[PDB]
Amino acid sequence: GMYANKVKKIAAVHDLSGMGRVSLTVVIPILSSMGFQVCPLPTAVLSNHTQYPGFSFLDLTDEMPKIIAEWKKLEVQFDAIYTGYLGSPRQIQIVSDFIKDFRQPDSLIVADPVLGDNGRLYTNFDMEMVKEMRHLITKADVITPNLTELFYLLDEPYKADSTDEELKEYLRLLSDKGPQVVIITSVPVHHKTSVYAYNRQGNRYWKVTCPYLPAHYPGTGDTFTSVITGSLMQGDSLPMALDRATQFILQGIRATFGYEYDNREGILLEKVLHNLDMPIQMASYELI
């Protein structure tokens, strides 16, 4: 544009949902509170996420390219591009072309390869959607698959108990498809849950382990990856980012779980947003 960004700008390719804490209504306040301008490229408008029984849904596939055409005319420079849940191969094509046209030598490209969970694909989707997400992540610097997504992206049978050595192998194989940094979430431990990561730079493998509370809050993945993104953009090391994001989520769940509560509403993000202002007093990351 006219001048270099005074606040770094992050193109956020997620939906807008009216209720719940998912997608743009978590990405925007988190990354803005971490110092960054979030510029939404919305994929859809929903009354609420699809974990409620009903929802309104308006597909924005056709508007995406029109927004992008305008951003080109404005000559906006993005310091990062963060993609989340994409509805189709066509959206992957748009997003893929968007990254191609707007990337710069210093861009951070973060893709959450939203495909499935608990070993099954999300019901919307099939193996072609897996194939196209696999093509998209070749362009990414950082990806954040869950364990289900890891195996689908690798085209491997889902396995729920892998050794650390096997997980290291998996991380490395997925990193060979493009991404310098691969982060796997929701990896079981042996009460307890785990995040693993590999960085092609230095060939390092990291893990963070933390308590697991028996509650599912939709939007947890988008929250995680928003904190990873903002921590990395702030210049934090990979394992510090794992730690900040896992602790932040844990804090939010602790702030939420003690209430009689409808979990579909999400983590009570607003009660813990400003925790990110405090320095981490106890890290737990491990080099493996």
The site that binds its own copies (CB under 8 A) totals a number of residues, namely 80
Restricted to residues 235-264, the positions that interact with its own copies (CB under 8 A) are 235-240, 247, 250-251, 254-262
Could you say which residues in the range 76-105 bind its own copies, by CB under 8 A? 76
Q: Does residue 165 bind its own copies (CB under 8 A)?
A: no
Q: Are 213 and 257 in contact (CB under 8 A)?
A: yes
Of 191, 106, 182, 202, nearest to 137 (Cα)? 182
Within 59-98, which residues bind Zn ion (CB under 5 A)?
97
In the complex with Zn ion, the residue whose CB is nearer, 62 or 106, is 62
Q: Does 18 participate in binding its own copies (rule CB under 8 A)? A: yes
Least separation, in Å, of the C-beta of 140 and its own copies?
Answer: 21
Asked if residues 285 and 242 have their Cβ atoms less than 8 Å apart, the reply is yes
- Cβ(137)–Cβ(109) below 8 Å: no
Residue 29 sits in the site that holds its own copies (CB under 8 A): yes
Q: Does 59 bind its own copies (CB under 8 A)?
A: no
- Helix, strand, coil fractions of the chain, as percent rounded to 5: 40, 20, 40
Amino acid (1-letter code) at residue 246: T
Region 2-61 residues binding Cl ion, contact defined as CB under 5 A: 3-4
**Sole binder of its own copies in the list 2, 104, 105, 165 (CB under 8 A):** 2
Partner from its own copies, Cl ion, Zn ion, none contacting 221, C-beta within 5 to 8 A by type: Zn ion
- The answer to whether the annotation marks 97 as part of a ligand binding site is yes
3-state secondary structure at position 64: helix
> CA 245 → CA 114, 132, 191, 230, distances in Å?
18, 28, 19, 9
- Which three-class secondary structure state does DSSP give residue 181? strand
The gap from C-alpha 237 to its chain's centroid, in whole angstroms, comes to 17
Choices 134-142, 186-194, 247-255, 266-274 (CB under 5 A): range interacting with Zn ion: 266-274
Residues 210-239 that bind Zn ion (CB under 5 A): 221
Using rule CB under 8 A, residue 41 touches its own copies: yes
| Closer Cβ to its own copies, 130 or 251, answer by number | 251
Asked whether position 113 contacts Zn ion by CB under 5 A, the answer is no
The contacts of residue 26 (CB under 8 Å, 6+ apart) are 219, 222, 223, 226, 266, 269
Q: Mention every residue, 6+ apart, whose C-beta is less than 8 A from residue 66.
A: none
Kindly state whether residue 67 participates in binding its own copies, applying the rule CB under 8 A: yes
Structure tokens at 140: 């990414």
**Least separation, in Å, of the C-beta of 230 and Zn ion?**
13
Q: Which two tokens stand for residue 21?
A: 């804490």
Distance CA 107, CA 93 (A): 19
- Give exposure, 206-237, as e/b (b: 16+ Cβ within 10 Å): bbbbbeeeeeebbbbbbbbbbbbbbbbbeebe
- The only residue of 277, 278, 279, 282 in contact with Zn ion, by rule CB under 5 A: 277
Residue 274 in contact with Zn ion, rule: CB under 5 A: yes
| Contact stretch for its own copies (CB under 8 A) within 34-42, 86-94, 108-116, 181-189 | 34-42
The residues of the shown chain that bind Cl ion, judged by CB under 5 A, are 3-4
The residues of the shown chain that bind Zn ion, judged by CB under 5 A, are 97, 114, 221, 274, 277
Which residues make up each annotated binding site for Zn(2+)? 97, 274, 277
